[PDB]
């Protein structure tokens, strides 16, 4: 889905996010790896330690991919075409992991923007992230 309303919220929260986008994407993974250790299985060649610059640079990666989504939210599929391949085909990431990632992303959003992280915005973020996830796992589908 994603309503004209959702669309508004997602573009709002992110507007808010700004340049810390990358900073947040990394916090997200970090949170993920600690709370969901099983996910750690995909980054075996990664230094998953606290200040790992590896995880640091990946966060930007993810973060930027999410930025690409927001700006092209009305065309995610075509937008994330490449990423779906990597994740579904090449990586074969268990769809469940997207639920775990999205969670930490939310948690991160919440931990930093108490002002903008309204119940309504929260919902639109969750909706948006599920869209992203669906496409990124759409090759399974």
Binder to another protein among 4, 18, 44, 114 (CB under 8 A)? Answer: 114
CB contact at 8 A, 136 and 83: yes
Smaller CB separation from its own copies, 29 or 135: 135
If one asks whether residue 53 binds another protein (CB under 8 A), the answer comes out as no
Residue-wise burial string across 119-140, b where 16 or more C-beta atoms lie within 10 A, e elsewhere: eebbebbebbbebbbbbbbbee
Distance CA 8, CA 48 (A): 35
Binder to ligand HEM among 62, 70, 79, 109 (CB under 6 A)? Answer: 62
Give the footprint of its own copies on residues 56-95 (CB under 8 A): 77, 84
CB contact at 8 A, 21 and 66: yes
Q: Is 89 annotated as a binding residue?
A: no
Total chain residues near its own copies (CB under 8 A): 14
Hey, is 80 helix, strand or coil? coil
The residues binding another protein (CB under 8 A) are 27, 30-31, 34-36, 38, 41, 88, 91-96, 103-104, 106-108, 110-112, 114, 117-120, 122-123, 126, 137, 139-140
Annotated binding site for heme b: 87
């Amino acid at each position: 889905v994603l309503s004209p309303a959702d669309k508004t919220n997602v573009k709002a929260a992110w507007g808010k996010v700004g340049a810390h986008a990358g900073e947040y994407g990394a916090e997200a993974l970090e949170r993920m790896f600690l709370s969901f250790p099983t996910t750690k299985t995909y980054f075996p060649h990664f230094d998953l330690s606290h200040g790992s610059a590896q995880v640091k640079g990946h966060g930007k990666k993810v973060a930027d991919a999410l930025t690409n989504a927001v700006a092209h939210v009305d065309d995610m599929p075509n937008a994330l075409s490449a990423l779906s391949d990597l994740h579904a085909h090449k990586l074969r990431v268990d769809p469940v992991n997207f639920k775990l990632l999205s969670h930490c992303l939310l948690v991160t959003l919440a931990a930093h923007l108490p002002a903008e992280f309204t119940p309504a915005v929260h919902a639109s973020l969750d909706k948006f992230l599920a869209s992203v996830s669906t496409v990124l796992t759409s090759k399974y589908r």
